[PDB]
């Protein structure tokens, strides 16, 4: 009534994440993924993720953000989060998580599968150097409705990837600390975990960056000052002028 | 131009039989048209509102050489008892969308590919 929304298909990872991983057990294995063994491993992973999320709240996220903002590394904050979760043991949910983990065969394969399932961003530098147009679809779209939809979507995906990466780091640290308590062949696993921890940490850092930016408000600044800054930057050789349509929201 | 009723077609006869609906005196049935430009085929997406359970049924309009017309049953999609606000069906990806407002005044709507196997499931939005 009055306004408008678009119904956009959730990505594979987001659609799976928004549904509890336990219910994924009731959906065909070839539908969850093409690799049935990989599908089972990922189903166990997402069951663990939902298990963690059922106890992790948004206030936890806020205090984690403050812990990162004032001096503390995100690895230390994640250690503190997992330590609080373990100290809150009344049922030993870590044992349930470990039981679900034995269902996973060589969890390095499954975690790298999540890595490839989320990899859609690649290291390329795109400056304002115009590419050769092939359709008029190059200039097509860019309206204010598109802007609103894109900003809502990036906020939502930033939040989802935020939660997913936090859970991934928590699970990495927990599995590294568990060692051989019900596990075998941990001699090679832990060293790979030591190597994969910093990379997931930097990925979490980037996704925290994007989520923080999506949470950041912006002030109403005159387009006159905007274009003055544009001219100054072009003079100092950090930007090249490109103008199609600039909008400031109301 | 003939000013006469050529035939009376029962939509439930092209579906596996449902006895109660055809004798039910319910009201609120809905018809939707979907034309395939490249196929020259017109599809009737008919929501028969049954107090038991409403249903979507997909038909194709067929006009024989003797001015006798019939409905070719492609699929039928049952629905749970709700106040159906709207429904659509597309032939480009061959899909049913349905939007209800339940008796608790809550907006619900879902989609399903009505050629993606035939025994009962819906994808929520």
């Amino acid at each position: 009534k009055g306004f408008l929304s678009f119904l956009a298909p959730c990505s594979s990872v987001e659609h799976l994440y928004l549904v509890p991983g336990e219910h994924l057990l009731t959906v065909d294995e070839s539908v969850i993924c093409d690799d049935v063994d990989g599908a089972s491993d990922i189903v166990s992973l997402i069951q663990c993720l939902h298990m963690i999320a059922d106890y992790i709240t948004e206030d936890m996220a806020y205090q984690m953000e403050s812990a990162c903002c004032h001096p503390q590394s995100p690895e230390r904050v994640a250690e503190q989060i997992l330590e609080d979760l373990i100290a809150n043991d009344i049922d030993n949910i870590m044992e349930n998580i470990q039981n679900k983990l034995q269902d996973i065969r060589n969890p390095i394969q499954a975690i790298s599968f999540l890595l490839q399932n989320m990899d859609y961003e690649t290291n390329m530098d795109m400056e304002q150097s115009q590419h050769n147009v092939r359709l008029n679809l190059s200039t097509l779209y860019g309206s204010v409705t598109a802007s609103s939809v894109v900003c809502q979507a990036i906020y939502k995906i930033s939040a989802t990837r935020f939660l997913i990466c936090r859970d991934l780091l928590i699970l990495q640290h927990l599995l590294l600390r568990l060692g051989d308590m019900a596990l075998v062949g941990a001699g090679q696993l832990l060293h790979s975990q030591q190597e994969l921890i910093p990379r997931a940490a930097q990925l979490l850092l980037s996704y925290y960056m994007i989520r923080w930016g999506s949470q950041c408000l912006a002030c109403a600044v005159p387009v006159d000052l905007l274009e003055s800054n544009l001219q100054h930057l072009s003079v100092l050789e950090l930007s090249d002028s490109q103008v199609e349509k600039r909008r400031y929201t109301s | 131009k003939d000013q006469m009723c050529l035939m009376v077609a029962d939509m439930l006869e092209y579906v596996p039989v449902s006895k109660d609906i055809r004798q039910t005196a319910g009201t609120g049935h809905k018809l939707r048209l979907a034309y395939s430009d490249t196929l020259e085929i017109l599809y009737l997406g008919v929501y028969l509102h049954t107090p038991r359970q409403g249903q979507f049924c997909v038909f194709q309009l067929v006009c024989t050489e003797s001015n006798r017309y019939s409905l070719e049953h492609t699929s039928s999609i049952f629905t749970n008892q709700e106040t159906l606000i709207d429904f659509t069906f597309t032939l480009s990806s061959m899909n049913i969308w349905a939007l209800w407002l339940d008796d608790d005044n809550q907006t619900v709507m879902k989609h399903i590919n009505f050629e993606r196997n035939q025994a009962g499931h819906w994808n929520p939005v």
């Binding site: 956009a8 802007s147 109301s250 | -």
Partner: peptide
């Protein structure tokens, strides 16, 4: 490969700026 189950999600469109079309009576 086999099959495709998809769920849509609501993304609010409309104008970030405040402007709506008034009906011509």
């Amino acid at each position: 490969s086999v099959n495709l189950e998809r769920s849509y999600m609501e993304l609010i469109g409309a104008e970030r700026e405040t402007s709506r079309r008034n009906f011509r009576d």
